[model samples]
Target chain A: LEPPPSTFQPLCHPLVEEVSKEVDGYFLQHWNFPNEKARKKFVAAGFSRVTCLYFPKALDDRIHFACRLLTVLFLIDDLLEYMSFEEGSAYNEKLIPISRGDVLPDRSIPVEYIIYDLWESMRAHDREMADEILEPVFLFMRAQTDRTRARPMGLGGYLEYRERDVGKELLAALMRFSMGLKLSPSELQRVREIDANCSKHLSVVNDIYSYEKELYTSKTAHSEGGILCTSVQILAQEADVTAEAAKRVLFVMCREWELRHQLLVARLSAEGLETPGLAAYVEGLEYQMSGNELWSQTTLRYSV
Target chain B: LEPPPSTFQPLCHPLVEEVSKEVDGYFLQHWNFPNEKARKKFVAAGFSRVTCLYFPKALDDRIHFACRLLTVLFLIDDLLEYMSFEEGSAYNEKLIPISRGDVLPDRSIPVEYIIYDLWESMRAHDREMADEILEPVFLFMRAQTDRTRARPMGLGGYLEYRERDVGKELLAALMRFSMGLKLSPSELQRVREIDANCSKHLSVVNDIYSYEKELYTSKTAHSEGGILCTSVQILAQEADVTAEAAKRVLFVMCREWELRHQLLVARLSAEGLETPGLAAYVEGLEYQMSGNELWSQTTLRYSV
Candidate 1:
């Protein structure tokens, strides 16, 4: 058989590249600190490469879909961690299994299956098939993220709360779940280390990037970044993973972190940005992850 | 009926008197303020009588059983409130209904019938009913009260961190649950006013009785005087009620509160208080509220 085409690419596309650059610029601008040298160090270390990629036309849609799905996964992981920590073995064990397991078929199936499924369904233009897969996934993710709906002031308080802290909680839960899979000790340790490092860095970064007024001053304000940071710290310590492993995990996290910032910035800066359009994008992004809501034609047209 | 035998008094058997005295003394000593003046005032106000009869024949065995039932109620109340708050709705809503509509066979049937059907079949007297009720309730309460469990530090770590805050949290949750019951508008407003007055008086009395180091400084330290003072304050504020109604409710609550407190104090005074026996009491209370755990001789023992 012909050698399989390289699955990985070092470089991203022009649109992806430009989007990444603008997004990084926006992130830097918003996250800029008074100390130029310190800011430079952070940027170099945290936002160095614009890690934006455009999957081959064959793969792009799926990959993008995958990224969104992964975001949901990441979110679910954080929520599970919070639930696990907040609930003892008795309660957590009883609840987490149903919340996390009911939708997804099996633990062994890599998250990539979800991404691939979405990509294939879309490529075939099978809207129904796409919906079929997306619907359950969305429900599962929603169930996972908002199990018990422990929300504050309910505009679907899940999204309104601190993202970073939630992220950490999700990560911790994911780690606990991973342990349940009975991975080799070394592998478990490695994954845990990554989780911890990601948690710590993301927490600080989230604190810096997050909307301060919403978190610290508002009645509904929740310290998301701090929560994320604390979760990561606890998980890392519990896993007893090496700091080096954590650093490696940070490297991976930083790449994704940079890309998310890049996407947000590009979308915000695009010409003709309007309130309805921005709202649509957010809703679209949420829908894309869960396959629930579809944006209005007017909203999509403005973006296109 | 022959003028209800005007010359006769209910035969106060010595054993009944002794048990009643202990029960009454327990309340008088623990439920009222420490001040001699307040004690005299309560006595003068005819707050000294026990409305509920105590059969000393049933004291050693039944009091312990009854107290166990109360503790279980306290724990279950904690669980229900915590679940309602943190989990939004109950995990096992179908399994455990809170209101009439929520229950099957409709809310029209007396609550007792529903309780009997739900629990009577599955639980085998002492073991299953007591343990199972405590299982979920304890897990949930422990998780909520102990922040360590609520977030991270793992199950083991959470179990290890025996902080004072957990006790305080449990107490607060119990108080909130006890007071938050749905009542008629008049009843609700009366209770709220009573609660506010009780809280205010408790705070003030706590300050006054601040010298009792063991009572004031222990991790779970709560002044008996403070609690009683608060109760009296609440009772005194209900002056608007008709004398007959006020007397009836006060008499009932006072007996119930004292009966419950006697057991709690006894439990606290025991060696290794966190033993299974104590846990059973907590569980029994939860089950009793559901009518799951009946106070049977087999279930009641002076010692575990």
Candidate 2:
């Protein structure tokens, strides 16, 4: 793995930073930390990875704890897989005792029978196979975030190939596995909120990436067709992109966000979490995201 | 007034009869009618009307009860109007006498002011005005329905001019007044459902009255042209009416009825009335309505 490019900046806007601070403050206020050191550790873990860490310990047990638990669970999963396969082999061997004609007699089996046997074996071997696949991928992801690569990796190469090919799948799988942990209602709600926020942030980052066409298009042609296309079309056709297209897009995106926020709140409430603040936070973030998009699109158009 | 024409049908069809039966059955089932005698009376009063009888009687009465109560409540409204106003005026007069001798009159008006001065006076005046205005018109309407008359009024003329002119405003006012009743949430919901249904029915009736030309026109009109004008042109141009046009009209009417049903159910739920089987009845009625309209329209189109 190569070092990330110097130009590759973290997509942290002031508004997002402020929101993150507010979320941290809420966690500190509500969560009973054992000591200042533990509280600091919790915040550090949360800030390091953009996941929720503020739920009651009984419900969530902090991000570090969740991660450590997942690791152990994964190891246990691996061990169970090997043990199951070994037991299955032993049972099969016992069924057709190795000493006699039973095993020697059926060497040339029907194609269908062989295929069925192979399928059973594969099913029995899945746990060990899954463990082998996941372990290296998890380690690789951790390595990418680690500090000491001497050679710089190009943005396109890292994101288009490495991240898309390996990182996204690993993260997605991890998220799915983590969520299957039978969390308490509050923990589930917190995690969902974190997921939603991350998704929203990624969308905004994509929009910003698209809006900065000069840098993006210098390397690719497809990059010219987003906000830039609208700007150029506005000049050519004497059309106001802001009033016509951007506003419409903003309205749609805002409406979608509002609908999602409402659904999230309903789900949270149904799950019996104290969700009044969470609902408001989602609503506020939706509004802020929409505002940010509109501002960015308008500014980009004007700058062009 | 001359007896209604022998040919002047009561809009009866298999569908209408079925719907009526369903509605009657629903009322009987839900109200726990002791016998057919009680059931007939219940049906005659209408589905929501019995609610009013229980209003002042039941402490746990809700909005549905209020709406139902309104049906009965409205019948005695005339009497309530006279009594409330008479008492209110007497109270005001007493205040005047007390105020004349004292430094300041008793500015604190009683709760009866709302019931008497406002509600009673408004209801009395409005109903009286509607009656005064509709009496002569009703006479003419009766005359038009009389087939004995030379050039008797057609359905179009009777519905569009007479019914719409005389009936719409009064009915709308009645609905507005019913909705104004201070009821519990459930009561309000029930009343609102009734209002929505009534409004939708009125709209459908209006459409039926204005049908022939508009229906033909709307069906023939091209999407590219001004819809209203194209509709008019198509109606004028077509020597033979198309079955398609009739279907369109029926579709619109059914859509309106469906919307009304939704509104009614919402209102009933809001009032907290446990009116089971109402939805099915309304749905059945709407289905029948559409079928009738389609049959009539198709028959008319093909008759020539």
Candidate 3:
């Protein structure tokens, strides 16, 4: 188990460390971790790397915009779901108004400011891009709301639930936005289908490797349901399977996902090299999927 | 199984039934029910009455505003989820912009227009009220996105998923808005706790009575996935229970929820009536809960 079953390849767009300190400065004040020690305590179990850590290298401003979004989403997954169902919804009510320019953000809820700032910054960059990105962002919050009140569905149920899940969509949108890449609706549709497996693999791969690390601490784990339902849990409850058997099954899924990913990459590079940045967009996506496992293994987020 | 486990006690606020037919001419122009058979088709499978069937008795204008909202939400759920995952997200992306005024209504996608009209109406209302109401309103759109992308979750997951699902919040918000009722933010908080059980009961009771109806047809069913995950699916998968046994369990759950409703009603009346309009709001919430079952059973939406 020293290395676990999943492979680690700590790769980012050469921008991870450059932005790490600023993210600490950017998010630290807004989030609960007030000091370096508190910050490290939280980060060791997965914070920055989960969403913000992997992005295509980009102009500083766009990257900063993306980072703020990633951080806010991460903290939102933490902070909003931290309370009881009713309070969380109230917290949601407070946070929602800022982006719409509907109400002034109350100072006490940090997410309101973080989101309002992101909305302002991102909207200024490109209102259309901001609109596209926010589509999934709101769904992610709804997904959290769903988790807060949810009963444990068996494995099949979780997979269906995964469809509404939005983290990956946010990731793909940011890749295009930060790089100033634009695909027309049809072109965008094409990439989504071509890269669909890797996109989904990003989620399943996340659970397999990060499952135990999530168990290690709730601070960095999703607060929506205390702990998320993972492939391991899915298999454990699906039949007469043991957790031991479930681990092997998840490990198999991870390996197969990697195989699908390589085929997707080769396919994209062949057809998309002429379509401006489609091939690179493919790289960023692959990074996101593989990064889901690698970061858990390599970063303190799961390295303990 | 004939009627499902939930009973139909189809009473409504005096204002409810009185206003529905007037809505036919009101909303018919915008929705696709002009043809007679299509009208019945829309009703027998997925009508607005099943979901948005309740309201507090009030003046004509307020009820009309409430009716437009209810009718639109029903259509939005059906229309938006009608595509594949990619297109549905695109479908959501298409609709969200109109609310924030970032996009214009294209000749396509009816939700865009419904939302734009909603946006304009709410904007014309007071900002504070608009903000309060839009809080749940955004969650409604987000819920649509979640539904489109959804795979069925288990019973527990269904309950949790219920939190983000928005029929009751819409009723509660409209009750306040249509009547021009505003509680101190803190006072609203007070009623929220008291009425919380009935608020949730609105959801479970929905799955129980309407679950089979949902499975009955897809002409008006959600487009995202063919049908949704319901509590029945959740219970059957959760235990070694038979489908018949699961129906009985839902019966017990619905009956208990009714008990909670009365207890909640008496409890709210006893404790919070002094707050202006609080008691009326409590009545509206219970009405929304029981009314969901009633309308689904009585209306053509489930009558088939």
Candidate 4:
């Protein structure tokens, strides 16, 4: 399904830029690292800045929460890429209960308290929405753990694995947080449908555009046996084409996918299932979809 | 489940030693390698890469088939440790169909021709048992192909993936092959039940004995940003124990698993499903289980 024309403008604000640094400072103080030197490397993953592109309109407090949550979300991504499968699983064991709110908020492991903190921030904003976000965050941990299986599957399989690693549900919750909406059951279901397509569109484009930069860096970055799996490689395998041809195919897929997403959005509005929450959520997605490419294309990270 | 007293005898035959060299000859010339110099490198890896420990009984043709089958099997093990995920998928594409004897016998890829040759070799021995054998061969190949399918799984999940790499069905069919038995449906079903326990027992034992080699070699062999994930890691992840602690736990689990297996065998035998061929097969399994531990303890490969 294709999505409707954009309704949201993704503009960086002074607060977002300022708060990004504050989150990094908070991040450094909040966690125990491997050593005194590990903190700088931890913050440099740049989750706060990257997240700001996806939801540019949130109030400062919500943006702070979003950045904090997303910063750690990306940390999970790094673990899947570089950590041993067992290490990833071990990491999952510690995070699942915390994300599920089943763990006592022990300060020893920061994820326990980090998730606890995030959950409280959500509860303060909307009591009814408190536990609603837990499953997605819990799944996000499981998804990273599951992604280790991708180590041995082909590009066709890597396609599905990529989605698991996207943390789609967590992104959905963050979308909810930004909209200031505590969704009804039907509304949540609608949000889910949008989340699925929205997340795919963003990741595919992100992978497609970033393919060159990744390939470029991988010569050195992957001096260890190999590089992380990418959409370009998956496209080549799935479509039975060259990398050059796969790049074109990816854009074609994106266009077609966007069309299908628009179709779903259209159906939701016409069926009269649209709520202000859904509309705002869609707007956030539009902001994300457009901003991801525009920002990625200009970023020094990709250009390097 | 615990198994009954081992029925197999560990004896070496002259034909086995001679055929060992012959199968190495079969492997060297059969496939196109990265280069001519690479042929010896492949053969030196040993014909019965992982299985020699289990069945040192070394009868002539049986030894040839076992060695030939295993030589290529370790090629698969290397794929998991070193190859990219998509690369592994591509390897599976060529292999899974050929193992089933479902392919067009295309010679461009030697494994296709090789499996096709193996099927014919089986078909020539007993036409009636041929197709019956095909499914297991197909599953065996798919299992190796699927061996790369690591998923986000629980401790429970480690159980099945262990079995796939265990080479269960192929070994079962091989027992039928060497013994010339065309099993009845119920008989094969009965064998299947035993195979479940047998393979798990052997595989778990394999990981137990071989864990140090894997852990040690992985540190040096896998120093190039590669790592091997074995049952030790799988059990530790699933069971949430220390590696050293998990090591001791596996042997206890092996004993219990054998107990469960023996219980099933006892129940099945009570139903009057025994056959002379099945008897000999059990003997070979005993041979394998008993022989594996003995041989691994002395092998220069393990010593290194």
List the candidates' TM-scores in order: 0.20, 0.19, 0.46, 0.44
Model 4: fnat (fraction of native contacts)? 0.00
Best by TM-score: 3
DockQ of 3: 0.02
lDDT of all predictions? 0.30, 0.33, 0.60, 0.61
- lDDT (tens digit, per residue) of candidate 2 on B50-105: 22221212222122322332332222221222233344234334433232232333
- Candidate 3, residues A1-304, lDDT tens digits: the string is 3322445354554655566667657776676565788677665644445545466455566777776677666665656535655666666666666876567766676767677877887888887877787666666566656642357556445654564564667677777788777778766766765455554456565665666755554456345545555655665554223454455445544455555566656776677533656666766676676666666556664445
lDDT, model 3: 0.60
The worst-scoring run of ten residues by lDDT in candidate 1 chain B lies at B294-303
Q: For residues B17-75, could you state the per-residue lDDT of candidate 1 as single tens digits?
A: 34445543443543424478654443332111111111111223233332222333322
Q: Estimate the Cα RMSD of every predicted model relative to the unseen true structure.
A: 26.5, 29.5, 21.2, 22.1
Docking class for candidate 3: incorrect
Interface RMSD of candidate 1, in Å, is: 25.9
What are the per-residue Cα lDDT tens digits for candidate 2 across A1-304? 1111121112223233444465456456544456898566555533312322211111221233223322322222222222333442342343232212224324343322332332243224343332332543444433332322223322222222333222333343333332222224464347454444334333323333243443344244322111122112221122112222322222222233344455565676687764554543434334333433343443322234
What is each candidate's fraction of native interface contacts (fnat)?
0.00, 0.00, 0.03, 0.00
The number of clashing residue pairs in model 3 is: 14
DockQ of each: 0.01, 0.01, 0.02, 0.01
